[PDB]
From Swiss-Prot, chain A:
Protein name per its UniProtKB record: Protein S100-A4
Gene name per UniProt: S100A4
InterPro entries: EF-hand-dom_pair (IPR011992), EF_Hand_1_Ca_BS (IPR018247), EF_hand_dom (IPR002048), S-100_dom (IPR034325), S100/CaBP7/8-like_CS (IPR001751), S100_Ca-bd_sub (IPR013787)
Residues at which Ca(2+) 1 binds: 30, 35
Binding residue positions for Ca(2+) 2: 65, 67, 69, 71, 76
GO molecular function, one term: calcium ion binding
Keywords: Acetylation, Calcium, Cytoplasm, Metal-binding, Nucleus, Repeat, Secreted
GO cellular component: collagen-containing extracellular matrix; cytosol; extracellular exosome; extracellular region; extracellular space; nucleoplasm; nucleus; perinuclear region of cytoplasm
Tissue expression per record: Ubiquitously expressed.
Species per Swiss-Prot/TrEMBL record: Homo sapiens
Residue span(s) of domain EF-hand: 14-49, 52-87
UniProtKB/Swiss-Prot annotation, chains B, D:
Phosphoserine carried by residues: 25, 183
Gene: ANXA2
UniProt-recorded name of the protein: Annexin A2
Note on domains (UniProt): A pair of annexin repeats may form one binding site for calcium and phospholipid.
Residues recorded as bearing N6-acetyllysine in the entry: 48, 151, 226
PROSITE patterns in alphabetical order: ANNEXIN_1, ANNEXIN_2
Glycyl lysine isopeptide (Lys-Gly) (interchain with G-Cter in SUMO1) cross-link, chain position(s): 48
Annotated consequence of substituting residue 23 to A: Abolishes heat stress-induced cell surface localization
Curated annotation (Swiss-Prot), chain C:
Gene this protein is translated from: S100A4
Modified positions (N-acetylalanine) in chain numbering: 1
GO biological process terms held by the UniProt record: epithelial to mesenchymal transition; positive regulation of canonical NF-kappaB signal transduction
Tissue specificity note: Ubiquitously expressed.
Residues noted as binding Ca(2+) 2 in the record, renumbered to the chain: 62, 64, 66, 68, 73
Summary of subunit composition and partner proteins: Homodimer. Interacts with PPFIBP1 in a calcium-dependent mode. Interacts with PGLYRP1; this complex acts as a chemoattractant that promotes lymphocyte movement. Interacts with MYH9; this interaction increases cell motility. Interacts with Annexin 2/ANXA2. Interacts with TP53; this interaction promotes TP53 degradation. Interacts with CCR5. Interacts with FCGR3A; this interaction inhibits PKC-dependent phosphorylation of FCGR3A.
GO CC annotation: collagen-containing extracellular matrix; cytosol; extracellular exosome; extracellular region; extracellular space; nucleoplasm; nucleus; perinuclear region of cytoplasm
Full protein name: Protein S100-A4
The entry's keywords: Acetylation, Calcium, Cytoplasm, Metal-binding, Nucleus, Repeat, Secreted
Sites where the protein binds Ca(2+) 1: 27, 32
Domain called EF-hand: residue spans: 11-46, 49-84
Species annotation: Homo sapiens (Human)
GO molecular function: actin binding; calcium ion binding; calcium-dependent protein binding; chemoattractant activity; identical protein binding; RAGE receptor binding; RNA binding; transition metal ion binding
PANTHER family (UniProt xref): PROTEIN S100-A4, S100 CALCIUM-BINDING PROTEIN
Domain of life: Eukaryota
Length: 95, 338, 89, 338
């Protein structure tokens, strides 16, 4: 069955995007601060405000790192995407 | 088989079934607040009859840079400029207030300058207000921004609409190259300046305007304050009275405004507000411009001087002279009662 | 727009594409989830769906135990799918 | 390496349906594109007067699976079920053919069975054809899918619409629990089954029908071929002749059909096709059902048997008995001349 369904392709993009940046520096299966910021700034610019407080980014990084190893693995990356989608749904629901 | 694996994963995740702990930080980093504000504003606009109440409640209760964020988000979402949408949706003075708030301080000052110099006539009162009240930093940014918003320099348009020593004064001030505050008092220069200012006007049959302009545009504000107080030793009239006797018209008004700012800028704006609401009707232009331009500068000090001098709060007079969402907006900019 | 953004948009819109058919417009009941899977992830359940297994799935996705699947639970579901597919990297 | 692929590998259970038959006339289209086919079919449907030609050309030249993919893509594109669209767009026997082709084999057989029992006037011929010709696996899937589609067990409907030993035989066969083909030839049991068949029938007054039912529904097909061959040693008439002498009506019809299916199923279907066309008009129901259901099973062997026995091709007979797009569809399902 060629031409994968929209949601299947969406999941594909979500998975590949992680390894697109995690496979640049340090751990090939984890994201550091720099890699995560590259992923955010490049792959999700529509979600970034006009300006970016570095402290809020540090708090974000700290909140995503659930097991406290100074990096974000695929699971925590997933909870991040989940948060983004939940924001979008907040804007969808009421309005 | 997929269900098996999914169940294993779900057990790994647990039933943490409250808004996830990182959600707050995510909202914070992405500036969720600005997006929500933007969407609420658009909803208020598209609402039949226009929901001005929400527009006021949001926009007059955000800092200027926050308003810039909201404008950014609004443009990204609606594909329409917030200023244009609100321009279409609003009218009367409320429109000028909201549109005024949407600009950065430099942009607002520049637009007000061009507005004062627009047409065959000229609102030299507004021009005088801005040019005499703004600091060096503010004036430099105002120049840089004015040169980009419009095709020409500020000074060029200034010397194209004014004339004489009034022009000389306005240009000198707009240069924004006033001497900064000094750690040294230099009492000799103070006495010499004061006595020079006396010998330039009152004692003379005429008046030496160039010396006046030079002294009152080049010297620093504290130095000029001490000079003005030393002036009371040589002249039977203080600086303001001396101005009122030596020169008439726009030059007189300019000098008076300048000295007022130098001596006590917040009191200057307080008196200007009081005058704006004093008599029949309202000088809405002045009131709006001051409330917008000083809301995040020295509004507390302005309110303090105002209460001190006139017995009742700025809030009181604003409430008494204006009504409706316009009034609500102005009161919001005020920041509370005194 | 960017690929990940379009992906997220598909995630969000797909939920409401099926959640608003019956009852609560913001939650997926069993049949709605089944239809969503049938149309959007046809290879998930496969040709023949194990009803027992599907009930287990529905039950375990319903974290707050209201017999339906809201958006957050749906996010957990998709996260599990993504992690599973990621494990075969 | 992709989500679709992962989910597919995980979904395939252990059973891969079953390997395709090399003796079907309809093969999988090599350069298959479900979206293109769905689009083209949509445009053919929405064309004024309906473009039946394109619809037939596509659907009769795709495997059943590929037709399911087309149906899925079509529903995704138009938000409308393909079967419903074609039902409204088509008519006559062509509609029957296309709609038949759109169903999975189990769905098709289930709905044909239901149709054979629906209404007080039971169609014994169709019921018999399906129940006597289908294998264990085919019948398991049929029981399942029938139960899913009509919320009633196939067996209960059979019991409701049949009676006597005819009922007993239909119910026994429908269970689809015939012994599987062994690796050893049981010569002793072959002989004993032959004797039992003889003793239960021709040798005695009346018939021991339950013995016949037991032997002919429970033993494997190859075993029973050998049993029928050995039966000729004991009886002066072969199995079919013996059936014609021992029983009558529905029961006789059922046994004759069953023994034919056991001895030579392709020949069975060839003879049924001939019967459907040989006389005045056409038995379109039977013709269509056979062309649809055997198109990916043994149509090549059916064609071989037919051409051998009747001297002209199945293609020829279809060509003489049917006309138009209907004819074209049936000929496509045939596969070719001879
Ligand atoms: Ca890395
Ligand atoms: Ca971590
Ligand atoms: Ca209104
Ligand atoms: Ca307007
Ligand atoms: Ca002018
Ligand atoms: Ca004089
Ligand atoms: Ca008044
Ligand atoms: Ca629902
Ligand atoms: Ca739930
Ligand atoms: Ca036609
Ligand atoms: Ca029709
Ligand atoms: Ca009946
Ligand atoms: Ca007998
Ligand atoms: Ca005929």
């Amino acid at each position: 069955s060629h031409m994968a369904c929209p949601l299947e392709k969406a999941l594909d993009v979500m998975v590949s995007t992680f390894h697109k940046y995690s496979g640049k520096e340090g751990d090939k299966f984890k994201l550091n601060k720099s890699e995560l910021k590259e992923l955010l700034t490049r792959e999700l610019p529509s979600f970034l405000g006009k300006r970016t407080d570095e402290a809020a980014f540090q708090k974000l990084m700290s909140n995503l790192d659930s097991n406290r190893d100074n990096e974000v693995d695929f699971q925590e990356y997933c909870v991040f995407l989940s948060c983004i989608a939940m924001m979008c749904n907040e804007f969808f629901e009421g309005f | 088989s997929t269900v098996h694996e999914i169940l294993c994963k779900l057990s790994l995740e647990g039933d943490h079934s409250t808004p996830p702990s990182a959600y707050g930080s995510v909202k914070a980093y992405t500036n969720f607040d600005a997006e929500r504000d933007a969407l609420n504003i658009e909803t208020a606009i598209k609402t039949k009859g226009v929901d001005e109440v929400t527009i006021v409640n949001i926009l007059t209760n955000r800092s200027n840079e926050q308003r810039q964020d909201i404008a950014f988000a609004y443009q990204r979402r609606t594909k329409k400029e917030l200023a244009s949408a609100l321009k279409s949706a609003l009218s009367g003075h409320l429109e000028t207030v909201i549109l005024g708030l949407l600009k950065t301080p430099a942009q607002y000052d520049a637009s007000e300058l061009k507005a004062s110099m627009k047409g065959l006539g000229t609102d030299e009162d507004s021009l005088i207000e801005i040019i005499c009240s703004r600091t060096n930093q503010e004036l430099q940014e105002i120049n840089r921004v004015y040169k980009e918003m419009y095709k020409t320099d500020l000074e060029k348009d200034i010397i194209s609409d004014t004339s004489g020593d009034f022009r000389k004064l306005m240009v000198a001030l707009a240069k924004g190259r006033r001497a900064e505050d000094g750690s040294v008092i230099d009492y000799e220069l103070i006495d010499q300046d004061a006595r020079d200012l006396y010998d330039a006007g009152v004692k003379r049959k005429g008046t030496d305007v160039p010396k006046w302009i030079s002294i009152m545009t080049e010297r620093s504000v504290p130095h000029l304050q001490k000079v003005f107080d030393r002036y009371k030793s040589y002249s039977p009239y203080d600086m303001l009275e001396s101005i009122r006797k030596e020169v008439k018209g726009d030059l007189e008004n300019a000098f008076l405004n300048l000295v007022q700012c130098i001596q006590n800028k917040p009191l200057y704006f307080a008196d200007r507000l009081y005058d704006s609401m004093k008599g029949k009707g309202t000088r809405d232009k002045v009131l709006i411009r001051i409330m917008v331009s000083r809301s995040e500068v020295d509004m507390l000090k302005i309110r303090s001087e105002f209460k001190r001098k006139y017995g009742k709060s700025l809030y009181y007079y604003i409430q008494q002279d204006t009504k409706g969402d316009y009034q609500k907006a102005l009161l919001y900019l005020c920041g509370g009662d005194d």
